[PDB]
Amino acid sequence: RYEIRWRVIEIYVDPMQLPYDSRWEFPRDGLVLGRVLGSGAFGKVVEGTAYGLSRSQPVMKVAVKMLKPTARSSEKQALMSELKIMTHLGPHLNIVNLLGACTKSGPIYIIIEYCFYGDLVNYLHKNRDSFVKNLLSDLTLLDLLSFTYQVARGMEFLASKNCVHRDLAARNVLLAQGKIVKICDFGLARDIMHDSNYVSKGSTFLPVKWMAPESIFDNLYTTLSDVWSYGILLWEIFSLGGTPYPGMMVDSTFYNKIKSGYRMAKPDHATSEVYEIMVKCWNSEPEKRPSFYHLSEIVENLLPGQYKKSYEKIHLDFLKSD
Numbered sequence: 143r144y145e146i147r148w149r150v151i152e153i154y155v156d157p158m159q160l161p162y163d164s165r166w167e168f169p170r171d172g173l174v175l176g177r178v179l180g181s182g183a184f185g186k187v188v189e190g191t192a193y194g195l196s197r198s199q200p201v202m203k204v205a206v207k208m209l210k211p212t213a214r215s216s217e218k219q220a221l222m223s224e225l226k227i228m229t230h231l232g233p234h235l236n237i238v239n240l241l242g243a244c245t246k247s248g249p250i251y252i253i254i255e256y257c258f259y260g261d262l263v264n265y266l267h268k269n270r271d272s273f274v275k276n277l278l279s280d281l282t283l284l285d286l287l288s289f290t291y292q293v294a295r296g297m298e299f300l301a302s303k304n305c306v307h308r309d310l311a312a313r314n315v316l317l318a319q320g321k322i323v324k325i326c327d328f329g330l331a332r333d334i335m336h337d338s339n340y341v342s343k344g345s346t347f348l349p350v351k352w353m354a355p356e357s358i359f360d361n362l363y364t365t366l367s368d369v370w371s372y373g374i375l376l377w378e379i380f381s382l383g384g385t386p387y388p389g390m391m392v393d394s395t396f397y398n399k400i401k402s403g404y405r406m407a408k409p410d411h412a413t414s415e416v417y418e419i420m421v422k423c424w425n426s427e428p429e430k431r432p433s434f435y436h437l438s439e440i441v442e443n444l445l446p447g448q449y450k451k452s453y454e455k456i457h458l459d460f461l462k463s464d
Contacts, residue, residue: 144182149306150230150303163229168243173193185221186207187328189206190204225252236293236295236325262313262378266378274448287444292453293323293372297372310371351392353371354367370428372434
C-alpha cells in the first residue's frame, strides 16, 4: 500500500503512536478540488483552492493528497501517519509544507503547498534546450546551483529533525513560485511497480540507482545515505534531467559494480567543483561523505554573495508569513 518513505529516528519513530494536532483540521467545504497533478496506484495529488486556510491569503491555491475511494482502512492509517510525521517535523522553506487536513467524516485530505513549476525533472526537460537578481523570481548554471543549494538547505532541515528521506531524487523535488525548491515524497502520484526508476528487489520496488551501497546490501538508511542520493540528484540536475547510469540495467552486476567502486562520469554541464561534490557524496565509507550542513556551506560559496542575501529575504518572508 501507499506509505511515505520518510522515517524519523527515535529505533525508528512509530507514526501511529504520534498524536494528530486537531489545529490542522480544515472544513471540507472550504476546499475546492481541481485537476490532477499526479495519479498513482493508491491515490493522487490534485490542485485545490482553499478559502480561509491562511489569514494572509484568504483565497489560496493548494495541493491535496488523497487515496482512491476503495482505500482499505490500513491505507487510511498510512495517510494519517504521513500527516502526523509532517506536524512532528514542522515547517521549512525548502520542503513541501503541510497547510491543513480534512480527517473527519470521509476520506483524508492532506492539504500541502502548491508548487507552480512542478517537479524538477519535468522542469529540466522543459528548459533543457534553452540552457543574477532574477534567479529567485518568476536555464543557466546559476539556476542549477540555486537548485543545488536549496536542496541542501531542505535536507539539512530534515537531518536536523533526525529524519531520513530514503527516496531523495529530482522527481521528489518540486519548484514553487519564485523558483523556491521544495523537497517532498511524491510517491502517491506514482506506481513503483511500473516505474523504471524503481527496481524489484526482495519483496518490493526500490530506487536502486539513487541508493547508497549500505542501503542496498545492508538495508541501512541514514542521513549519510541521503547524501549519496543527493549526489545522484546533482547528477540529474547537471545532466538537465538525464537518467542516472544511462544505458546500464539494474541487475546483480550493477550492485557489485557500484560496490567495487564504479561511479558516473562528470555531467557535461557540471563544473569541476560541482563534480567534486558528487564524488565526495559517493564515498563508499558513509562517514567520509559530507553532512548537509557542510554541503550548504560549500554550495553557498559557489554562488554569488548577493544570492545568499536574496535567499534569506525570501526565507525571512516565509518565516514571518502566517
